[model samples]
Target chain A: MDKNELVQKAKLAEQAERYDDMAACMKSVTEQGAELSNEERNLLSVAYKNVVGARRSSWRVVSSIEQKTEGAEKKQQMAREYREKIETELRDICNDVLSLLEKFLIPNASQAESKVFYLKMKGDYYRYLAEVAAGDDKKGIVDQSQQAYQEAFEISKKEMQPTHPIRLGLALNFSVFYYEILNSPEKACSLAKTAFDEAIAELDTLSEESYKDSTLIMQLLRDNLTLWTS
Target chain B: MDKNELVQKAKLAEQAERYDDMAACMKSVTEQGAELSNEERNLLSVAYKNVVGARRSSWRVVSSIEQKTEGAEKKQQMAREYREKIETELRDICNDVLSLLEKFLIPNASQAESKVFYLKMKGDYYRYLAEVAAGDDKKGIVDQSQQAYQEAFEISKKEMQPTHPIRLGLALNFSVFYYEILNSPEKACSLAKTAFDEAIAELDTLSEESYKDSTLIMQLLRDNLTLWTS
Candidate 1:
């Protein structure tokens, strides 16, 4: 099949949630001397993330079974190993996407827009890492995730402006770290309240048509504030 | 392969978002005289719903393009036809699921839980139908949907009790209809507020373990109340 046909098939496969098929078809076409388009690279990254998501859900079931089964000592061992196994597998998947970003997306990082994308993905990877980490290791992983988020926030502040949805998202993620991972409810509530107010205030500046799109971000900001404060 | 293996493969296919593959596998297995378990039937229903959802999204694009294309009259005609096509296709899928319910599920409908399930599915069909309906027909479709929900509510009230999650879902759906379809925010808010309070009041009745699940339902009730009230 031609490039267009392969691209169409890949999209259909992705839509159908057949991420493996999409990845294989895209990889096959690219390996046959076709340079990866920016869109194709994005699609591949999405497919990889979804595959990881599916595996994570399966591991959740496995971990649950380990918790429920008989024999206290054996179950404890099974649970410990299962947790380690999931963490390793998640880290591997995170690395796969991060590598893809470094190879393709990072080359465009000098561009203000691309820099935001790079930082957000980096932050997301670290957040995923923090989730899969156990006990004493979790704090360190969360700190790394926070640092990535802070870097992303700085870039968004400098390049994207306060009212930009991307900047709003960065703020939300930063607040989430405090609220969810760090258990600093006061800090999370304070940050999220400010961010929510900022987003709501920016609504007046948007054109009617633009406001339609931006309202969703505003609603999310409100949700974050409510979640933290309540 | 045995029934368990087939069901397991079908579930994996679903997780991969390969609904067509899942449906095909299930159909092949069942055609070979394998009896459909309740779990398998539920899986098939979900697969069919996803397939219809994909088609609806595609038709949205088709209808949008028809607006952009030239020739005002012809474009309008094309858009109308596309809408009609999508509506007819969606109806067919709804009917397919409804028939499946009748043939496989309704046999168990003597039980109050199964009756509630039947009514909920019937309600869902009319809700889907309402969305694809034209302007004049929309109100009638929504009314029918509400009627189905009312029947479900009656059953749950008599058999399931107020604090049940299923009962709460039925109440939420009723509120959604009033708020979203009928544009009766006042009535929606009143119903949702009572339901929300009832769910909250029942908190002390739940055992510590069951409270975990009940709290999720409480959160949803709170969300519904907030939405309608706001």
Candidate 2:
């Protein structure tokens, strides 16, 4: 067949759900990064997380089957391998997001300013994933949630002067880390202390600086920190 | 503001928009360590945080007064004292809740069993708090929260064995401290890492363990943990 005929035939085959052939045909489509709007970026983040979830689930199924059936040990070995592969992919996705988060955080702001953006974005991302993670088939991703957080922490620095409200946001997020994931009683307490102290300090500075901004934002931060402290 | 008149005023003030004073009265009624039902406990938790918020708004008022009036050292000093007193109360509240939590976790659990229970309960608690912490009024409860967390951490170790899930939850909560309050990037990352690892390990263990107790309770834990882990 001529090249045009072959190309048309491959396109038809791919559309017919021939994944292997589709992969073969798609080798011709050059990869390029299209610029994304905020909405699009959010969509991409969710879409990427979903794809990760599916992969994670597939590994989980394999692992489950291996555990429950004949030739269990052999299948168990294969399943463990599958589990690792899925975990790696999940972590990779987290790393990719981290790189982007770093870009967002470092360009133009105090680490605290960038920190607020980082946290808002990070919180939205995790909260989104958390909703999905709440589903039974999708829980595996929760296990990987720390990666996104790790990336966030990499950008925030202890002594960085935070613009008031953001400092509180970051602390609230840290409280999540201490009380939820780390499960280290020691670390949780220490981190909680820091979040509390920095938050109050920032509140003082913020009060002195601006009245033009809505007071509710500061109030909300206060409410949240207070929730945990009490 | 006279003594007997103050008492009479405090009583009547309860009817006006004196929520702050009302909280103080309720605080006295509960006496900090009073036993409460789960529902009551949750209610008190909400109130404690709110009082913390009220104190925060009061602080903001203090900050504004500092800005408008030169050498309002007296106001600032009183504000600081008030803040410290409220902090003590908040700490007491934390201590009580933590005590209750320990009471809930300690019974009918082996070290291994308790580890799982601790991690799971902590996850649930942290998630609930994270929601509150992230909600409106994020900044009000700094010192009080530190006090609560101090007691919480002490209880966690005093009562629980370190395990993957527990540690992971701790890590996540700890990172929240950095991001939410402390604004410390490095610590946040480290805590996040620890949480991520623990969560991953717990999931791996859980996926297989689900089949072990396919009966009702196990299924529930499996279902719940599955939701959180994802």
Candidate 3:
């Protein structure tokens, strides 16, 4: 199949939650020895991220299980092994996406929208690390997530309007990090409140075409704000 | 196959994420027209819950997608349909599990631990309802979750020590309801702090056999306290 066909196959695989199949299709597309278009690279990044995300979600469910019969030592050993397996499995995909964005997406030089996408992906990797990390190890990982979001904020100011879906998405994710991982409800609430105000203000200006995505992000922002304040 | 073999097969199907297959196995076991032992009923309840949980997780990921091409009205319709699908599908399993608990599990009343298990399952179903609900619909569902937890707390007081794992799990989940869905940081913080204190105090009393599970729960409680307080 040609590049378009391969990309279509990968998307179908992604929709089916067949991360292994998606990654394989994307990898095959890259191996065709042709320069990847921007869309192809983005697709590749998404496929890799889904692979990592799949592992993260599955391992999270496993980690939550309380072993009824296993001894303390045995359970600890299994957890340790599980963490290592996830880290190893995700490392390549993480690196590949980081490399793809670093090589292609120039900060300030690229479209502000593209830059926000790059930064969000970077933050997500760190956030996933924070989610899976145990005890003290989470602190540093979560700090990286904070830094990535902070950088995304800086770029959003330069590249997009306050109400842009990309900008709102950054705000949504940053607040979630604070609320969910970094343990800073005040910061989360403050950021979400600001985002909600901006989103409500922008509601009338958004074209019908752009309104759906913006509405979803605004709902999320409002939800976060309500939760944080309550 | 016998009930035990059928139960084992259902468990394997659940592990494989074949929810339909698991439900089929459980139904076949029931159709044999034999009285279900407590263990068998519990296994059937677990199988149905797993099926529902799997569907919820998969649907949740789909709901997050931002349809860039679909019109706003179309997307809204899609979301409404998706929400209804989830509500109806989960409602059935929730009712089934409640029936199972009420019919089989409570009659014996030999084990306080078993009662705790039932209440927690009841709490979980309501909690899942809170998760998928939106706007005003969420309020009543979350209230149900709180009520279930309150009942669980009452049972814990009567049947178990304060620091028992079952009791601690109740505290942890109730706090989570506050923090994650109900949006009451102060209450969440207060409950988690007390839970954490109780957990640390109990560490010395827990046997080496039970220490593993206790330690994991303690870590989670501590983690929650830190997040809520921060």
Top candidate on lDDT is: 3
User: Which 10 consecutive residues of model 3 chain A have the lowest summed lDDT?
Assistant: A61-70
TM-score: the better of candidates 1 and 2? 1
Ordered list by TM-score, greatest first:
3, 1, 2
Identify the leading candidate in terms of TM-score. Answer: 3
Give the whole-model CA lDDT for all candidates, comma-separated. Answer: 0.67, 0.43, 0.69
The deviation in Å at residue A52 for candidate 2 is 5.0
Clashes of each: 2, 60, 0
Task: Score candidate 2 by DockQ.
Answer: 0.01
TM-scores for candidates 1 onward, in order: 0.46, 0.25, 0.47
- Computed on C-alphas against the true complex, the DockQ of each candidate is 0.03, 0.01, 0.02
Q: Write candidate 3's Cα lDDT for A1-230 as tens digits.
A: 67776776566456546566667877777666555565666677678777777666656544543243246664445444544655665666665655554554433324567667778877877787777676766787777778878888998877677778778888998889888887889899888888879778766667676678878898999888878787
What TM-score does model 3 achieve against the real structure?
0.47
lDDT of 2 by residue, B150-209 (tens): 444445545543333343344445455555565666565554554344444545444343
Chain B alone vs. reference chain B, TM-score for every model: 0.74, 0.36, 0.77
